[PDB]
Design a protein around this ligand. Structure first.
Ligand SMILES: NC(=O)c1ccc[n+]([C@@H]2O[C@H](COP(=O)([O-])OP(=O)(O)OC[C@H]3O[C@@H](n4cnc5c(N)ncnc54)[C@H](O)[C@@H]3O)[C@@H](O)[C@H]2O)c1
Ligand SMILES: NC(=O)c1ccc[n+]([C@@H]2O[C@H](COP(=O)([O-])OP(=O)(O)OC[C@H]3O[C@@H](n4cnc5c(N)ncnc54)[C@H](O)[C@@H]3O)[C@@H](O)[C@H]2O)c1
Ligand SMILES: NC(=O)c1ccc[n+]([C@@H]2O[C@H](COP(=O)([O-])OP(=O)(O)OC[C@H]3O[C@@H](n4cnc5c(N)ncnc54)[C@H](O)[C@@H]3O)[C@@H](O)[C@H]2O)c1
Ligand SMILES: NC(=O)c1ccc[n+]([C@@H]2O[C@H](COP(=O)([O-])OP(=O)(O)OC[C@H]3O[C@@H](n4cnc5c(N)ncnc54)[C@H](O)[C@@H]3O)[C@@H](O)[C@H]2O)c1
Lengths: 251, 248, 255, 247
């Protein structure tokens, strides 16, 4: 059970992170939605009730992420779970032939900074807050769950920056789990396929037609169920799980 | 949830398969333990009550597996879930120079037959029984979960036969999920690390990063329940291993 | 350089194993084609000249493989390299809903037996032969190269048996490398994508006439000589071990 | 044969990139060592003679890489091969309890910027130069080889930033190969284990066989075979003596 756990969920105002918060709060946990000020964070935290609050923060900022973790610790006393869902996507070829356009350096850097450096910035700072917890009976002080993508493995045309960012999350999953093993913090990454979030919601239903079964986009509530299972299962650690209806992405 | 689902669990008399049966029956499902006659299948099925029965079957025998599946379908109405836990292990080097000892072909074949051919035998026969179910509201007719091992990825010295058998389970997970997509059967594989079961029959726990101990069979059972419940998990292998990576 | 090495190449009468033998013999190695009697083995070994001989053997037979290895080792004095290319393919769904047909157990067992158990059979029996070699200055006594397939990773509809057998070769590559590390035999597996060989008749027809469009670049079937070049690089590079290499034009296979 | 090809090798002043340049120039190719101004690049380029020049540049700078590729084109006429070996490493835990010390953001960013963004920076700019080449008889215009690491798969304690950077090179190998397929540029990544370069010079004893650090010239051989094999694309190759890294 997740009842009573405190979860900080980056990208919590929409899509996968919002669905996660709704499921964990419906199961008794407390959630802090960490998302940018221009998001619907405050609306969604109101709708989810008194066990969910909004902490405005950009995951690339050390100050702002420290302030949101400080608010979560003040309000709820501790942090037990962090879910990294904050992310952006772009579709830009390395070299776009009809326009003779090279991918810019700044667009690659922006996707790296939000998705990869932003996820490490939350990990590193939440690990220190989870380390102040007393261990449970099984030695555990917290669980950190990251969101990669099947683009880490079958990146499509146009996905170089996105796939590098998500490959980086995959690549650092095991060394962070090994780093935090002495303090009892599990680190697991989910790699979603194609899900019905603002990111995707003809262009869309072609995509969807490619998922072997079920033959549709993923429902965010399915991601949220996998996050609850990862929190609950004490032995799942250092691993990346595809959640994708058996799709393999073509170019 | 899993309430009302009917599961067939090979290797169900012991270890990971027994723990899986205990958990699903505790959650309201029915389980049929498929295991060899020499096992404690009957006593464990009686202990679990009327929603658990024992069907004696060797998974390399299509006659015995098909009889066990028919007993399950007649007793409980249908089959919704199959979990392949039947398996054996050996630790035999390919070649051992000091004793000039070559791994026998028979010892390799035996592990492939039980672990890999036996798992495929169950999959192919249970698929058509699941195909008889009316699809649920999301189109699903059943879920098949296999047991590979981290030895599919970091096989140790002595594990050539076991690793070939478990790498075959890994390798066929995707094409069987693609085969069965049109009738709504999901296929997922769990790759355990080191677990506390009779398969071990004295320094193993210290290698695991965290938790730094052998896995508890009930943690495998919990992951099985999650795979059964999640409609979108398919064609994937999941390591359940405390972040271990095996050295030689 | 492979000049002077003695290679035993199973599946040597055709396709990838034949091209391998042609390249290695053209670079000065000696090659023993191991392939079934009912094949072009003999003719191809004659066409390749005196450094190429045909040893009839089914890789599922312990006695035939041992007799082919013994023939290589007596004739040429030693065995330095083994290449496993013998294999078969079938396209059979686990369950075919339209025909209400279940994959037979014997069709799965036969593909496992040739592709997986036959490769292990060659490996286990050649390992002791290579361990009689004097180790070179780097400690090496031999190299074993196996052929899996991208089907170990992206098995298609109908490829359950094939992908199980090739997944088995991938899964055992590391433990066999670790087993043979103390006597200096490297173990490497190549996973080809789609190659222009007599094996292609397995695909539908309107599906084979279609392959090239799926390969990003080069946008065509692989040429067997490209597999052979990769085999030569694996034999030459001393530090390649316990690894599987995809050789596929960057394809990822769809269902 | 690589005879006549022009290769730009980042990190060319030392270690794996230098051994690659030595091997390729000894097989008749031409090589441009792209490495920082403070490296020994110019002296190593003179020792290899007229077919090897140095282009001082930091791979994280657009301007300096553009200048380096223009120098390569001006000297040798075209670019056929790029090899990304420029890289750095740190050993810093995500959180170190005994010191109560969080890994700094800046140390992680530095490693990501040189290893990952710097490799993409070279890839994107060299792809435009290789697209100026007429295709060979097989449609190819160039070959780009990157250097990841086994730390992309078994990153050790202290390797978070390095493993993130190297996992990003692995993750982007396939989409970049797919992006550049229509212009005939293959993209392949090598993931070395443990090699005897300045980055390292009991680790030797953990390699199954050969039981030693890798010799840079074995990485160089593997680069030459990737350049020569027309069908290797979108793949990552471990070059590691069968090691699997423990924590
Ligand atoms: N939807 C898919 O199909 C899919 C597939 C694979 C992986 N993902 C990953 O799932 C995660 C969740 O995405 P989603 O589909 O829910 O999309 P979404 O756009 O609905 O939600 C992402 C949220 O992240 C927030 N965010 C973006 N940049 C941020 C920043 N710097 N700091 C703080 N918050 C920031 C956004 O404001 C938004 O609320 C992302 O990491 C995405 O890459 C999505
Ligand atoms: N315990 C571990 O550390 C571990 C780690 C990784 C993978 N696994 C895998 O988990 C699965 C379960 O093993 P376990 O640890 O529970 O061991 P176990 O020995 O306790 O249980 C395996 C059961 O399979 C049965 N079985 C063996 N061969 C059979 C056959 N031909 N037909 C029918 N039943 C047969 C045995 O009688 C036994 O009851 C196996 O596939 C095993 O390879 C185990
Ligand atoms: N051609 C492709 O597209 C492709 C793709 C991936 C993997 N492969 C693998 O490449 C290897 C070579 O296949 P190919 O394409 O060269 O096909 P091929 O049919 O041209 O050659 C395979 C050879 O293996 C021999 N062989 C089959 N069973 C044997 C047995 N029991 N004992 C001894 N020899 C036996 C056959 O007689 C044949 O000469 C096979 O392992 C195949 O699975 C091929
Ligand atoms: N040596 C190993 O054991 C090992 C193992 C795996 C991966 N690698 C990777 O191999 C590659 C080569 O490293 P190496 O071992 O040869 O080490 P090295 O230090 O000998 O060579 C790396 C070179 O990259 C250059 N470089 C660093 N930052 C740069 C920048 N911003 N711009 C331009 N040049 C820059 C350095 O000046 C140096 O000449 C790196 O990517 C390294 O991460 C090395």
């Amino acid at each position: 059970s997740v009842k009573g756990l405190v979860a900080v969920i980056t990208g919590g105002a929409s899509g996968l992170g919002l669905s996660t918060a709704k499921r964990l709060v419906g199961q008794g946990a407390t959630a802090v939605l960490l998302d940018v000020p221009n998001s619907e964070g405050e609306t969604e935290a109101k709708k989810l009730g008194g066990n969910c609050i909004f902490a405005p923060a950009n995951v690339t900022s050390e100050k702002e992420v420290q302030a949101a973790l400080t608010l979560a610790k003040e309000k709820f006393g501790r942090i037990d779970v962090a879910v990294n869902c904050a992310g952006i996507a772009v579709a830009i070829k390395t070299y776009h032939e009809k326009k003779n356009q090279v991918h810019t350096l700044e667009d690659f850097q922006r996707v790296i900074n939000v998705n990869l450096i932003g996820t490490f910035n939350v990990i590193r700072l939440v690990a220190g807050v989870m380390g102040q917890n007393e261990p449970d009976q099984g030695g555990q002080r917290g669980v950190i769950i990251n969101t990669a993508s099947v683009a880490a493995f079958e990146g499509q045309v146009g996905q170089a920056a996105y796939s590098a960012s998500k490959g980086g999350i995959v690549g650092m999953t095991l060394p962070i789990a090994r780093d935090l093993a002495p303090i009892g913090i599990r680190v697991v990454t989910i790699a979603p396929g194609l899900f019905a979030t603002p990111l995707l919601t003809t262009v869309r239903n072609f995509l969807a037609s490619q998922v072997p079964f079920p033959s549709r986009l993923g429902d965010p509530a399915e991601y949220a169920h996998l996050v609850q299972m990862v929190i609950e299962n004490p032995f799942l650690n250092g691993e990346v799980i595809r959640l994708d209806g058996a799709i393999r992405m073509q170019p």
